[PDB]
Each structure stands twice: as structure tokens, then as C-alpha cells.
Symmetry: D2
Subunit: 458 residues, 4 copies
């Protein structure tokens, strides 16, 4: 495992504390053995998500201080519009308060747009993999969310350069079975979050866009971690070996018609989202009409002016290769520490998290008894580290192909010594993994259990 | 006209400038004679809205700096939960990114909850006056938005203590006509924004709630300007003349089962919203299930942790009577300046804006030629001040006739001084003779729905 | 009285409260009837100084956030150097933590410089009027501080354009009587704080510098309020009627060899100072050597990097004419309110404060009983406003006589911070003082309960008679 | 070498970059081969000082935002007064803009106080080791600055618990030789910065104060790094095994009559200083009278209100044992990395820096040719790391004074750099082991008369 030094220094700190073993046992019981219900005061190192927990720079805080809070015509709305033209060559923007607000703006408009002339009678969305909120919006609008990630993403320990790729054969098969008139949109998720923050190749993005364009299908780029995808392209595609990150990004977005973005990831923000449209002015107008009642007026979209200002600066800082190299290298360091100790992970590591394969880490625990959650609760009790489950506990009442515990790493927040604490904590549980029991419900809500369900050890 | 001194001093300033007469001309041209299309750089004093443009305190900024940005279980979420229990006596909260986000969380849930056993086949919402986004969400969910403000709200120059009240007779008539089983909810809007920021009396709130409870109707308090409403109750209701503002708030929320709040108003924030539920845990769980896909996880609701921290502090600052006295007194000062010069306004002034009655101000322009908008564009070109609402332009088409056609001079909180107010009043007064020669306005580009935002007009 | 609207809007507020009459009486008694001992918690509107209480802008705060805190070679030190070259055409800068630290850097160096050839045997400094700290550093270094402001400054109610002018006749007389070899430096104070914030004309600055240069005398511009002085020059000198503020400033500093500046005044800061030297590299080297043990390393001079960053932005904002017009107009507004009500003041009002002439205002209390302090205490008890005394209480006792020094003026200074209070705050101040018009006759004198030997106005405890 | 994990996480970052080899050589030439004259833009990792470069907490920034900027009676002045009473049990405070301003306030006052009744005609100050500005203020006022640190400090590689102690024998000898009536004050520097940030033991502080009280000598604690000194006392003195840091601090300040503090060190600030006096109201009044013309009015002392507010918060954070353990552990980690690789350092590492013994590293350069400065200039050109010299360059009388030690100080700001930054520093210096024998001395081009190392320009001797 190789430690990479920070291309920055610390300007402001925030205290953290390790609760005592008895505090965490009380806290985990009070939360019903669901870390989602733990207060942050009971957590030492928080690896629940990489969303909205990033450390901003002094230039970002400076930009917030001079932010224009105007309800209409904010100086920062035009700066953001100019930034999206520079980065993506897209001509229209609609800010949103975060990524699922951006999805709420655009997806219903795409369905309405497709439903013209009696099309989309059995409408579907096709992605390499829909994120949970993305699939929820697909399903809320009466559509089905189809995921066709490459089969290589389900072979955890088998290296592949592009585990986020579309399965091109499945894409064509789905276009032939459902019909282009039923495909509301293709959603390219970069990186593919649910497959392990795994990158999609430039040539895979290109072939998907070519296929969609010959069938007249609209392509939306889910762009939460697009800078981490661009870095992987430059690292692993020889055609982009000497390209800048911004040149990679500029090429990526030739292969979509629009983007939905959670700026709470790669743009290094604590809040914020964006809709950007390449040139379809009609879809832009319809999305603006939905933005008004759902998010806010069209030049702030549910965001304070200061946060649009922070987004403009963070959009730049997130494309800096020296930072991406350290950021992604830190994820790779925690992953190497675990692999060296025989802990199975999604290999290679993705851009934002280490996905520990708990299906083989605790085989004695069946899927319905939530093996990855049992490992997560044990990691929390032993260490105060909070991780998130991506398996059977997520999206149930059901069986899952993968059972990952996601160690999600906020950007510029934790040091490699924090990584060592995380790795050593999981390594010290190797003898307890065999004797580990499963989990059964105490209270189960009808929907969205993983967020607010209560469990108990069997 | 009496100037009230600030119960604070300035700690941070923000530059503004008057663009030249030439620049203002060119600017309004490129904006198609629509101020909603103007960039902020073309505006001197911005009276478009009082939403999200407020000046925060140093204590609010300090709260943001130590805000907990955690995805789940943020320290500031629990503080906000305690604060809502303190102010409203409500046991459950769901943060939202702003007011219409709160409405998107709660209104679909109330509809689905009302339809649980097969009733509410013709669902409606009843309010003293649904705000634009509020009425939009009820209609996007298939219901009708029924507005029943008191008739006194329609006699502008004639003083009344409570021009935001419900018409209780119309409330009972609509219950009988549609049936209680079709009334998804009653929405008590305080202050009543569309009536001129005019207050609702405590006894009006009390009677509406009791009528609703005997019929089993859920009551929601639209709370964007609840502190300004509480101030007016203390000022005009003898029962509360000697109560604190917090005691008036506490009593107000005995007459609702939940609230939706834009924290961008009376809590003195630039962003933020809130859903609070008194004790109905089933509705709380259903609203939480909708908050997840629409806004965010249930312990931040589409807000940065620092904005929840700012909301906990701002909810306290917004109830302080010394501040409310100055805030509402500054709006009254602007109104008294225009009223003493013979400019008709909604009298008495509300809590957050002066509503200039343009029907009597420019009678030679019909409603379909947008008279209030003509006054606004004339005001802008004269001074650089940007105002909003046209009644007609806002009402749109079905062009439905407008009961009123106000120009709204909306005042952000703790932002402008009374010398800024003198500039606004003197600019409008200086136009008195020009209102006669004032031209109507016609569309050059017209969008269908939501024309007030993006239509490119041109002078007739 | 004409209210001038703010050329800005408010972005952040600080709560203030009026303490109850009971609290104000208790606090003043606890403070020994000396508002300088009051905590800020007992003050509503604080008019003690215009120093370091200013409201900064969002651009100033943004500049602080990205400030470079390096010990040596801070990015903001080089920006400050470029800014002083732009504003003043001065080639060398030494930051200081505030104005009196800038005086502590420069004044002892000038004395040692003048002593190089065995000169300055009876050294003196000559100013239109040394400020208190300026005079203290002169005297601490064994020199005498000579003030020669125009006689017009002492005619309180008689208007004049330039009540801060040097008396040119006295300048030549002092040069002849002391000799150019004994005059360590001429200090041009702009505006002239002690004369009431009154401006110095460009032609008066020019003639002083011309007289000094032929005699080989080094000229220091005391520049705490140079932007307010530049505004008055543009307002009242026809030659500069169409010049920009920066053009006026650029001309002003042709008539000095260096400057000492409190950035806590016109540059709109809460802390900060500056030494800038036109072109004498030798004096720059000596002042750097004194900066190191007194203030800090030469690229921060006792300032956090963020404060140098704020100073670069505030130097720019302080020169903007629309702000200066509002700022100086607010002072004139408070002055006209009092003047229209019969309250005697230093007329015309200066750049930063209104000086109420309590000699004319009150008669039943003599100078040795501190008349201006009795009004200040009355004003505080009535309103929670804290003002500062510029009279017999401040003047002090004569060590030769051991008794009260006779004071030419018994002023109460209503000192106005920049971009902090509105014209409604001014009305509150004026109405408070006007409402005491009948009570002034029955106001009692003040006597010491505790008197320290030196600098008594800061910590002496008084009691009513 | 053991890495200690941060008891915090990062909230805000500041970019740094590595200037190219050509930029550095251009920069160092323009800087006259004195890194003090280098712009920060030419530095990668800045180890020039631990003074005022620290990273504050969100609680400190929040305190600044609500700071009271009043000229008289600021709310934060009374908080600072209460905090000094809580921490040190001292009744009087005068804020200062930084440490040497605190010295400029107090030292001349102490000389004047001592000169009453016509004594102190040959006035001196005695310290375990005066810091540079401290000795400058002693000498500017016409006194002599006598340093009497333990000889243990001069054996770099031999461990000792308390290499910052006073030599008690030399203390008694200097009192007898000069007379107690000529000792203006004894200055106890904690930690002893010039000895290598090495702690003074509690019993050494006690014995020094007891000797001084029996002779009527005033004692000032130079307190820039008093928390790091308290940590070492708790770590190495068995008597304080079960004591809190604040109990150790409270006990330390029983053994002084006043303190002068650079708040730019252990209180974790970017600016700020403090004078605190235990109970001598007369010296308090005289120091206030000097504070007014030198620093500012006595309730802000040359500080913005926001900086006093940050000081009140940082004074608390600087006492937290979990932070001190990490902070001093990071210094020890850099030291152990260099010591494991054969680099001679002052052992054990002190609180705030690693002191590389260059008299052993580069023997072919004599002291008067500044051997530690030659290692520093070579370190910068190689890596962009800026260090500072503590030897002959820092040190009739104009002839080059002999230096007991020739140190390169790798000074570590608080909560700014990670242990991966420390690895970069260590590998960079380790990587110069074969170039050390080839290094050349340095000669003056411009020499100031006082505190020459700050602004002097040098040239290689080659
Ligand atoms: C690919 C993708 C995501 O990963 C995503 C959010 N992911 C979070 C919540 C995570 O923990 O992965 C979202 C939703 O973004 P939001 O959390 O609404 O800003 C959309 N697309
Ligand atoms: C003309 C002049 C001044 O007015 C001045 C400070 N005057 C203040 C404190 C006042 O209250 O008038 C100073 C001292 O600046 P300082 O307060 O040290 O930043 C120097 N020159
Ligand atoms: C009564 C009322 N309810 C809900 C909202 C929507 O809240 P939001 O989403 O903007 O935060 C508003 C907004 N009124 C603003 C827009 C105005 O009067 O201009 C309102 O006045
Ligand atoms: C022991 C000691 N005393 C006094 C001072 C002066 O304090 P200051 O005026 O800088 O705030 C310092 C500063 N030492 C810093 C400069 C260093 O060792 O790099 C110091 O280490
Ligand atoms: K967040
Ligand atoms: K806003
Ligand atoms: K201040
Ligand atoms: K600093």
C-alpha cells in the first residue's frame, strides 16, 4: 500500500472523538442496530457517504462570502452557466438543490417529452446502473429502471479496467425488446456508483451514444462523480494518456444530450446540484417550468447564492489532476491495506469508496439475514467507524447479486492515518467474522427500511 | 411617517450602485421589458421579493461555521427538532430546502392519507389564500385550490385589523358543497401573503381549527411569515397586548396539526424550509418516505448542515419583538410616505411589503395591457428599483380578470435603511404626472404557462 | 439637515440593546463615572472612537479568508506593497499592527538619522497638530512636540475651509528659532484630528513640504484619515473640482517623504497600520531593523496575513467618492441637527466626528471640574450613548504646577465609525443631546475619587459634586 | 517511527505546490541565499516557524465572527481576563499584538521598577535561554542577557528528560557575581526554544523560583509553548502521572510572578500575545501605561476583538491532552524517521520542531561559515522545504561569536501538515546524505547590527 501526500495543507480543523465501547453499544441499540439512525455524536470516522461531507478550500469559502443572494439574476447563476459551457460545452443550465432534485426536474420532463404522439406506452429508463434515488424517480413516474452493467462488475476479485461499462449486447437487446419508442432515456452513470465507483470507458460512452442517436434516444449523463471517471480514463485509456482532465471531460460530454449532477460529490460541496442541457432548448424550457414549483426560481433552483458561488469554484478544483491523484490514491491505499490482509474487496478500487465483498467475508450469514450489515455493525462496535450497506438490507421485500459494505471516503477530510485506523479496525475482526451472526427485524417499515428500520441480532 | 431606529448596527456591507439612465434603458430592452429577466447587476434596490435576501447576524454566521455537515444525524438537526418543539409544541420535524420543497413533501402525503379508505374522489384544499407555489402543488396533485379570504381584503384604502382572515361563511359553505371527505386540508396562511401580507387574528385561526376538527379536516399552517403575523396579533388583539411574541406563536399553533415553512422569510435565512407535525406520527412517517427521493435524507432534507444551524439561530432572532417592531415599522414608513403623497396602497401595510393599488393609479390602461407592470417598468427606468406582481400578468389565462392589480414593493429583512425607503418613495412620487401619459404593454414573445417569468414584452 | 443614502446595503448585523436606566446608572457608578471604564455591554451606540470599529465589506472578509499567514514572504505583503506604490507612489512599505506601532517604528529611526552628524542636540518635531500617541512617541524619544495649527481652528463657530492648516508664519518662526538641525521631522496630520478632523489644503501641504525640502527637513504624513482629507480638497479647492479622489491622494503625497498610517480609520479595518517611505532606502533599512524587535518580521509587521489582505481591499474602498460623500455627509447631518437646535459645535464638521463645544454649552461647571465630561455622563445616563472627552479631563495636570492645565477647548467628541450606524442612529444621538437642553443648567461638576498620576482619563474614577 | 492519528478531521484546505528546481534556484539567488527573504510563493512545505501559521478550529473561527471590536471594554477582553485567572491564577492581563510586543510592554517596566531606590546600576536578565526577540529587548534597554541552560542540552544524541532546565549552580553563581540588586528578572522559557524545544521540569521551575524569591528577584515565564512543556511534565514526571494538563499548568505558574506569551504558538493563533501578572498591581499599572503608546488601549492591546475571541478559544484547545499527544507525536515521528536513517538530531525531540545537529552533518564547514545554514539552503533547493538556522548565523563584540550548537530547525506548525508531509521532509533530507560532504560555507554580503539572520544577504564561499 502506497501513501500519497496531500496537494494541500490544512487551514481549518473540526474535532472528532472516539466514543467508548459502551457508548457505541448503547448508541447502536438505541438506533435499532441501524447506523443510519445513529446521531453523528456517536460516530468517530463517518464513512456513510461521500455526499455533502467534503472539506472546501479557502477560495470556496471566499466565493461564498461574496455570493449574490438575489432571487432573480444572481451574479453566480451566470458564472455557473459560463462554467458549464466551458466544462461540458452545454448551453443551458438549471441549478438544483442537489442531485435528486435535478433528477426530479429532468426525468418527468423527459417522460412527458417522450409521451408525445402516443409513444412510451410501456416506458423504461436504461442505465449501466441507476442509483437508488435515480431509480426511485424512474419508478415514481410509472417507468421501469433497467440496469445493464457489464458482467465483469459482479466478479469482485477479478480486475477489469472498466467495471462500470454498459453491456452493449444487453443495450441492443433491450432496444429491440422494448422498442426505441418506449426508451425514455439512457442514463450513463459516471463513475458507476453502485458497481463500486467503477469507471466507464470513453469508447463505451461513445458507442452507447451512437447507438442511442441512431434510435433517437435521449442520453442523460449522471455526473455526480464525473471527475473521478475522467481521471480513470486518462489513467487507463492510452488515447488520453497525455490529455488534460478537462480535455477528457470535454470529450465525455460529447456523448450525452444532458446531465444531472449532484455537486455534493466531485465539485467538493456540502450541498448543491445542477441540470445542464447540451442544445435541446425545448427540453430546457419544460425543465424550467418544473423547476419553479419544485425547486425555486430558475436562476437559483433551491440554492443560496453563496452555494452557486461555491459550486463555480469547486467545479474547477474538482478537475485538478494533482488532487484527483491523491484523492483516488487514498481510496486505493485503504483498499490495498485490506487486500494485503486478505480482506476481499471490489478490485480494482473505484474513485470514492472501498467496497468490501461481505458475501465471501461472512458466508455463514445468508442474504436475507443481511451479512454486510452484520459486518458494518461489528465494525462500528469495535471502532466507532460508520459504514453503509449495499446489499440485501438495501432495497428489500428480495435477493441481491452483491453484498458490499461501502467504506465511503469524503473528499479532503481524512488523512491516511485515518485510513490506517479504518483498515486496522476491520483487520482486527478477522477472527470474529466466522462466529458472526445475522440480523432480523424488530420494526420494519413498509418501504425504505434501510434508512429507518430497526434490527436485532439473531 | 415615523422612522424607527435599527435595533442593531451594521457589521458587514455589500456594494450596490445605480446604473445610468442609458444602462437602465438598454438593460430593460435586453430583458424584453420584464424585470424578472433582469440580471442583478442591472438593479439598484431590489424589491422583487423578501425571500432569501435577508441579512443574517454574526451569530447566524457563527452557527454556520460550526455546522455539522453529516449525512445522517447532524447535530443541528436535533437542535432544530428541539427548537420546533419549543416554539410550536410540535413533536416531529422534516427539514426541506425551502418552502415549496416543504409543500412538495407534505401535500401529496395528505392527499394519499385522505384517500386511504376510498374517499376524497374530488379532492380540494381550502385556504384564506394559497400562495402561488402552494396552489401549484395542490393542482399538480389533481386537487383544486379554493381561496376564501375576507371581503375586507378587497377594499384597499379602508382600514381593517385582520385583512388576512378566513371568510368563515365561505368556509362553512365550501365544506357543505364539496363535503368534508373531499377536503384534503385547510391551509392557514400567516400572514396572508396574497392579501397584502395581512394578518390573521387568533380568534379567526381558532374558529377555523374548531370547524375543521368537528369535521375531521387536517389543518396546515403556512408559516413563512408567522412572526410578522404574531406581531400583528400582539399589536391589535387586546387579549395578547401584554403577551410575548413567543406566547402568541405558541397559541397560534394550537390551531393547526402541522406547518410548512419557508425559512427564507421570517427566520432571516437565505435558504431553508421546514415541515413540522404536531403529533400525527403516521403522516410524519409518510412525509419522511417522500422526503427521501424529493429532498434528501430525513435529517438534513436538502440543506447543508450549516443552513440548519443558521435556521436554529434565525428562528430565535425572528421572534424578537424589538426587531419585529423595526421591521414592520419600516414597511409602514414606506407606506405612510406614499399614502401621504396620495399614492393608493393596501391599507394598513402588511408585514413584509407595500402593495401599491395600480387599478386606481393608472386607470387609462386596461388590465389586459398590464397596468401595474407599466408602473414597475417606469419605476425601474426612473430609479433602478425592481418590483414585482401585476395581478393580471401573474393571474395569466384560463386572461382571467384580477380582483386586484397590485405592485409589490417587497422589503428584505435588515438589508435597507429608511434612506433607501425615502429613495423608493421619492422615485414613485416623482412619477405622479407621468402615470397619465403611461403606455400599456403587449407581448413580443409570450410563453404559455408562467408568462410573468420569461415573457419578452414591448411598449404599446 | 440633509440625509444621504447609503451606497451599499447591509449584509450582516450585530445586535445592540439600550440598557435600562437602572442598568446605566449602576454601570456608570461601577465605572467611577468614567465611560472609558464601562464595558461595551453597558453601551448602546458607542461614539468613543472611529478607530477599529468600522464595518468591513464582503470583499474584505473574502480577502481575509484566503489570506496567506506565512511568517516570511506572505502573498498579501506584496499586494500591500503594490497598493502603496499605486496610491502614494511610495516605493517601500513596512506593515505595523496599528498606527502607534507605525510611529514606534519610524519616529525613533528619524531621530537617530538626524543625529548622524552630531545634529539634533535639542531635537523637536513640528506638526500642524500631533495626535496623542504621536506626541507621546515624540516625547518618549526625548524630543519636544510642537503644534502650529492655524488660529482659525480655535474659533469654534467661525467657518473656515481649512481649519487643519499649518500656520506658515509659525513654521518659519520655529525653523529659525530651533534651527533646521534640531527639527527631526515635520508631521502633516491629514485630516487634523485634534483640530476636529479638519482638512489641510493641498496648497498648505505643498508650501510646508517646499519649506521643509529647502531646509533638508524630513516630512512624515500622518495618514489615518487621508481619504477624508482628500474628499475635502476636492469639495473646497477649485483646482481639484474635477479630479478623482485617487488623483487628489496622489498629489497629496508628493508633499511628504514618508507616511505613518492607522489602517483602523479610512482603510475601514478593525486592526492594522502601515509605514510607507517614498524613496529614502537608508531610512527604510533602519526602520526595518526596528520593526523586527518591536512589531514582527518585515513582511507582516505584527499583523495576521488576513489583516494585510483586508487592508489591500480597504485601501481601495476607502477612496471611493460615493462612500466618502455618504460618510462625511452623515457626520455633517448629525452636526446640522445639533446646530439647528442651538447646540454649539466645531463648524464646519470634520470628516469623522462632531465636536460639541461644551465651553459655550455649559457655564455653571468650570474647566477644572470637567464640563465636557459632565455632559458626556448626562448623555450616557439619558441614552446609553458613549462619547469621549477632549478637554480638561484629557489634558490632565501639569507636573510643574501639580495642578490642572488650562484647556483651550472643552469638546465632547461624537466619533462616528464607518458604515456602522444609520442616519436613524444619528437622530437618536442628536435627540438625546437636544433633550438635555433644560437639564444642562442644573448639571453638577465632577471630582476625583481616584486619580492616577499619568494618563488619567483612561482609568481615573470620578464622583459627582 | 510511529504515526499518531489526528484527533480531528479537515474542514478547510489551502493549496500548496512544489516550485520547479529552476524556480527555487532563481528564488534563492534573489533571496541572497537567506530563505527568510524567500516569498511564500517559492516555498512548498514551510518549516520556517511554528509561529502564527497554525490551523484554527471551526470554534475559533466562529468566535472571531462574533468578536466584539469595541475600543474600550470589549466582551472578549473580560473573557480573556477570566481565562488567564482560570489557567494561571493570575489577576491581571494586558493583551499584546504578539510575543515581542508583550516583552516590549513588560521588560522596560521591570527595569524601571528595579531601579527604584537607585539599584540595578549594572542590570541583567537571567534565563535558561532567552529567545532572540527576548534578548533583543533586554539589550535595547541597556541590560545584559545571561543564558544558563543545562549542559545536558549540549549533548545532542544523549537522551535526557529535561534538556531545557536551568543550570542551578550557574543561577546561584550569577546571582552572587552580579548581585540580586542587579537582576531585573529571571526569565523561565517553557519550552526552552533555543535548546531544541526541550522541557523544563517542574522541580527545576520550583527551585528557580524559590531561589529567586529569597533574593527578591522577579520571575517572568516566557510562555509561548507552555502547553507543550506541561505535556512533557505529565509524560516524564511520575508525580504528575494522574494529573490533568491544567493541573500541571496551574502548578507551573505558581513558580513565576508574571508571564509574557506569544499566543501565536500553543494557543493556536495566527496573531496575538498576552501579558499576565499574578498579583503585583504596581507593575500592572506601569505596564498598562507603557501599553497605551506602544500597543493600544489596555482592553485590546493591539489586537482586533476577533483575535482576542480566538485566543480565549485557542487557550482552551491548546491544553487538550489528545491534541498535545498528537502534536508532539508528529514531531517525534519526523525525528525518529531522521534518527532511524542516521541523521543526528537533538534527542529526544522537543515540542514544536526537530533540531538537526549540523555540526555533525557537515564537519568540513566551520561554525563561522554557517554550516547549518548550508544544510538549509541545500534542503530548499532539493525539495522546496524552507527551514531556519539556529547556530552561528543566528548568534570586539562584532567578531563571530562561538556557537555551542549548530542546528537546522524543522519547525512544525500546529494542525497544518500530515504525516505524509513529514515523510516528504524526511525523505528529502535523508536524500542529501551523499551531498553533505560537498557543501560549502557562506559569507555575508549585508549584515544588520542586530538580529542579522532575519534580513541579511549571503553568498556561497565555494
Ligand atoms: C450516481 C448518483 C449518486 O451517487 C447520488 C447520490 N449518492 C449518494 C447519496 C451516495 O451515498 O452514493 C445521486 C443523488 O444525488 P443527491 O444525493 O440527491 O445529491 C445521484 N446519482
Ligand atoms: C491622527 C492619528 C490618529 O487619530 C490616531 C488614532 N486616533 C484615534 C485612536 C482616535 O480615537 O482619534 C493615531 C494612532 O493610530 P492607532 O490608534 O495606533 O491605530 C495616529 N494618528
Ligand atoms: C406564504 C408562502 N408560502 C410558500 C412560499 C414558498 O416558499 P419558497 O419556496 O419560496 O421558499 C412563499 C413564498 N413567497 C415568496 C416566493 C414571495 O412572496 O416572493 C410564501 O410567501
Ligand atoms: C520563546 C519565545 N519567546 C518570544 C517569542 C516572540 O514571540 P512573537 O513576537 O514572535 O509572537 C518567540 C517567538 N518565537 C518564534 C518567532 C520562532 O521560534 O520561530 C519565542 O519562541
Ligand atoms: K452536507
Ligand atoms: K437567496
Ligand atoms: K477593533
Ligand atoms: K500569521
Amino acid at each position: 500500500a502506497k501513501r500519497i501526500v496531500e496537494p494541500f495543507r490544512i487551514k481549518m480543523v473540526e474535532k472528532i472523538r472516539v466514543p467508548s465501547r459502551e457508548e457505541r453499544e448503547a448508541a447502536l441499540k438505541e438506533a435499532g442496530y441501524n447506523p443510519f439512525l445513529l446521531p453523528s455524536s456517536a460516530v468517530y470516522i463517518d464513512l456513510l457517504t461521500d455526499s455533502g461531507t467534503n472539506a472546501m478550500s479557502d477560495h470556496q469559502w471566499a466565493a461564498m462570502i461574496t455570493g449574490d443572494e438575489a432571487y432573480a439574476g444572481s451574479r453566480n447563476y451566470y458564472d455557473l452557466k459560463d462554467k458549464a459551457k466551458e466544462l461540458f460545452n452545454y448551453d443551458y443550465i438549471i441549478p438544483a438543490h442537489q442531485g435528486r432534485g435535478a433528477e426530479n426536474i429532468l426525468f418527468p420532463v423527459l417522460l412527458k417529452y417522450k409521451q408525445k404522439e402516443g409513444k412510451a406506452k410501456n416506458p423504461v429508463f436504461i442505465s449501466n446502473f441507476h442509483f437508488d434515488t435515480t431509480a426511485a424517480h424512474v419508478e415514481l413516474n410509472g417507468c421501469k429502471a433497467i440496469n445493464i452493467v457489464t458482467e465483469k462488475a459482479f466478479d469482485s476479485e477479478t480486475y477489469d479496467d472498466w467495471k462500470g461499462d454498459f453491456d452493449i449486447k444487453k443495450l441492443k437487446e433491450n432496444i429491440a425488446q422494448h422498442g426505441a419508442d418506449n426508451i425514455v432515456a439512457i442514463v450513463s452513470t459516471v463513475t458507476c456508483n453502485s458497481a463500486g465507483g467503477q469507471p466507464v470507458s470513453m469508447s463505451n460512452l461513445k458507442e452507447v451514444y451512437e447507438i442511442a442517436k441512431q434510435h433517437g434516444i435521449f442520453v442523460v449523463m449522471d455526473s455526480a462523480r464525473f471527475c473521478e471517471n475522467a481521471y480513470f480514463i486518462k489513467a487507463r485509456d492510452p488515447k488520453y494518456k497525455n490529455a488534460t482532465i478537462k480535455e477528457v471531460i470535454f470529450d465525455m460530454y460529447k456523448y450525452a444530450d444532458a446531465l444531472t449532477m449532484s455537486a455534493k460529490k466531485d465539485p467538493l460541496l456540502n450541498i448543491g446540484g445542477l441540470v445542464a442541457i447540451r442544445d435541446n432548448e425545448e427540453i430546457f424550457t419544460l425543465a424550467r417550468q418544473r423547476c419553479v414549483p419544485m425547486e425555486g426560481f430558475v436562476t437559483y433552483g433551491g440554492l443560496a447564492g453563496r452555494d452557486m458561488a461555491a459550486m463555480v469554484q469547486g467545479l474547477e478544483e474538482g478537475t485538478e489532476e494533482e488532487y484527483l491523484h491523491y484523492r483516488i490514491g487514498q481510496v486505493k491505499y485503504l483498499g490495498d491495506r485490506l487486500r494485503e490482509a486478505g480482506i476481499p474487496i471490489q478490485y480494482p478500487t473505484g474513485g470514492h469508496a472501498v467496497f468490501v465483498d461481505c458475501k465471501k467475508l461472512v458466508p455463514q450469514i445468508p442474504g436475507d439475514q443481511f451479512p454486510a450489515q452484520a459486518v458494518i455493525n461489528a465494525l462500528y462496535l469495535e471502532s466507532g467507524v460508520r459504514a453503509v450497506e449495499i446489499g440485501s438490507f438495501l432495497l428489500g421485500r428480495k435477493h441481491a447479486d452483491m453484498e458490499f459494505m461501502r467504506l465511503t471516503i469524503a473528499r479532503r477530510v481524512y488523512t491516511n492515518d485515518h485510513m490506517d485506523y479504518i483498515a486496522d479496525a476491520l483487520i482486527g475482526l478477522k477472527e470474529k467474522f466466522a462466529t458472526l451472526k445475522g440480523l432480523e427485524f424488530e420494526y420494519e417499515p413498509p418501504v425504505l427500511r434501510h434508512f429507518t428500520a430497526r434490527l436485532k441480532p439473531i
